[PDB]
């Protein structure tokens, strides 16, 4: 603090600042430009430094709009990273990376604060809690048991149901959870954030009648922002959760959507900083940045952190390096496919490529694990036989093989549940299925005693009882 | 006997067609992989040369 830096070169989002020869800010400090807007009032464009350029010059990163800054402006160092308010104050307000309440409400308690940049905890302070908790979605319950306090990533494309699934998952989990949640918007649709805002104001988890009684903290660094904002909003949301687990020491929920926009902002700013480009154009500090943001989402003996984050895949090619690194930091993955998304099965979570770490005999029980791997067996058999029946036909197989064909073509329907928030896209009342119901229904489908139902009567039903009701309805409507 | 014989001839012709089609798809796949590797190296060395 108490110095003056000169803007020397502005190539868009990157900034070259010069300082007096002695006093130089550390890396990951927070400058603050005493600039002005088009109206001339003193407006701030907060700024994070990334690199000592040398010859008493540094290269920086602008956290907000660059249009309006001139070569010859002034800037002041804070001597510390971008501090963010923490605690019970930040509960029920929209938040940006600059620690500003964005919703039209008053100021905040500014005395409880903490910096953004920190590291992973002590390795000897890690909680080995592997307890299952019930979600509700049939695929998410049976074939991919979710670790409480473990990280969860929903690998998908654009427009297959990542946001719908995560919104219904908030809807189902946060009301019956035992801890304070935090949602972050990282490079996504603004009106969809407004829809979440209204739909969770009305659904009482904001409980906007009295402030500080809300159990969610909303942060938003969405698409229309400069790459510094999306580059550090995820860090800000994680640091809020880290306060809530380090001093309030309780379980939290942290939904970091969309983490690929964080990595993409890093690449957009990294190509301009002079980095020799890595694979297809991402930064070279890809895996270390992904870990440095990921590894501080963790459990501990003070409180675990459950983290269902939406992660985007370009062109539905899982080979690409940003998902190729994000697979390496996740516990129970979920890979929404374009195949089921175009086929009509909603949710389009592919039963096959999805695979977790909790589904073990000694972690979930023997019969759940057994019926789950038998379901995976039947589906793998069907997608194996697909390329054969593509040209062969339906009448050159065995009774075992055609039996598994019809059974898997029932199963792929049965794993589709009409969500609460899917009513606008489906037209079906609210359904929430139990785990016992799912395992019982899959034993009813697999054990052969349902080979006489209508095959289309398994689609978007909640219970296997409702599948029997669909069979009765369809046969009654056909026979009149 | 005649229908099993005619079906045997049809299966043999399908196996020959699948042979030729497999060879052509292999040629095109090798070409696609080569052009993809070349495009990657080109864009990488271009982005590096830029800086």
């Amino acid at each position: 603090k108490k110095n003056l830096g000169r803007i020397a070169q502005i190539i868009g989002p990157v900034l070259d600042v010069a300082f007096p020869p002695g006093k130089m800010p550390n890396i990951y400090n927070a400058l603050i430009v005493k600039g002005r807007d088009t109206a001339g009032q003193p407006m701030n464009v907060t700024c994070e430094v990334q690199q000592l350029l040398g010859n008493n010059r540094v290269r920086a990163v602008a956290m907000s709009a660059t249009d309006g800054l001139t070569r010859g402006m002034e800037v002041i160092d804070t001597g510390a990273p971008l501090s963010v308010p923490v605690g019970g104050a930040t509960l029920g307000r929209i938040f940006n990376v600059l620690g500003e309440p964005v919703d039209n409400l008053g100021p905040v308690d500014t005395r409880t604060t903490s910096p953004i940049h920190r590291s992973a905890p002590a390795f000897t302070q890690l909680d080995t809690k592997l307890s299952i908790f019930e979600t509700g979605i049939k695929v998410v319950d049976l074939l991919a048991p979710y670790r409480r306090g473990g990280k969860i990533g929903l690998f998908g494309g654009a427009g297959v149901g990542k946001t719908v699934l995560i919104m219904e998952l908030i809807n189902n989990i946060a009301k019956a959870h035992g801890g304070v949640s935090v949602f972050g918007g990282v490079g996504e649709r603004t009106r969809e954030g407004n829809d979440l805002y209204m739909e969770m104001k009305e659904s009482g988890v904001i409980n906007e009648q009295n402030i500080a009684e809300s159990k969610v903290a909303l942060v938003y660094g969405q698409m229309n922002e400069p790459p510094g904002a999306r580059m550090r909003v995820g860090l800000t949301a994680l640091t809020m959760a880290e306060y809530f687990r380090d001093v309030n020491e309780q379980d939290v929920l942290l939904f970091i959507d969309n983490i690929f926009r964080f990595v993409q902002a890093g690449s957009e700013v990294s190509a301009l900083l002079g980095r020799m480009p890595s694979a297809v154009g991402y930064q070279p500090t890809l895996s270390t940045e992904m870990g440095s943001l990921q590894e501080r989402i963790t459990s501990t003996k003070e409180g675990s952190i459950t983290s269902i984050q939406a992660v985007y895949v370009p062109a539905d090619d899982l080979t690409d390096p940003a998902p190729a690194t994000t697979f390496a930091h996740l516990d129970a993955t979920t890979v929404l496919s374009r195949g089921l998304a175009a086929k009509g099965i909603y949710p389009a979570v592919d039963p096959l490529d999805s695979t977790s770490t909790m589904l073990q005999p000694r972690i979930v029980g023997e019969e759940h694990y057994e019926i789950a791997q038998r379901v995976k067996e039947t589906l793998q058999r069907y997608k194996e036989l697909q390329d054969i029946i593509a040209i062969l036909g339906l009448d050159e197989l065995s009774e075992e093989d055609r039996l598994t064909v019809a059974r898997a073509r029932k199963i792929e329907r049965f794993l589709s549940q009409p969500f609460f928030v899917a009513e606008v896209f489906t037209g079906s009342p609210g359904k929430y299925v139990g785990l016992a119901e799912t395992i019982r229904g899959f034993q009813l489908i697999l054990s052969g005693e349902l080979d006489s139902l209508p095959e289309q009567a398994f689609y978007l039903v909640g219970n296997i009882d409702e599948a029997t009701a669909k069979a009765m309805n369809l046969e009654m409507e056909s026979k009149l | 006997a005649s229908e099993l014989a005619a079906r045997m001839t049809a299966m043999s012709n399908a196996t020959d067609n699948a042979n030729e089609l497999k060879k052509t798809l292999s040629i095109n796949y090798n070409r696609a992989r080569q052009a993809k590797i070349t495009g990657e190296i080109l864009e990488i060395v271009a982005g590096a040369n830029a800086c």
Binding site: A315, D316, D317, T319, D387 | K22, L25, S26, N28, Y29, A32, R33, K36
Partner: peptide
């Protein structure tokens, strides 16, 4: 996603 569907069609 091109090489993936290419290899899978070969198989």
């Amino acid at each position: 996603a091109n090489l993936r569907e290419l290899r899978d069609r070969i198989g």
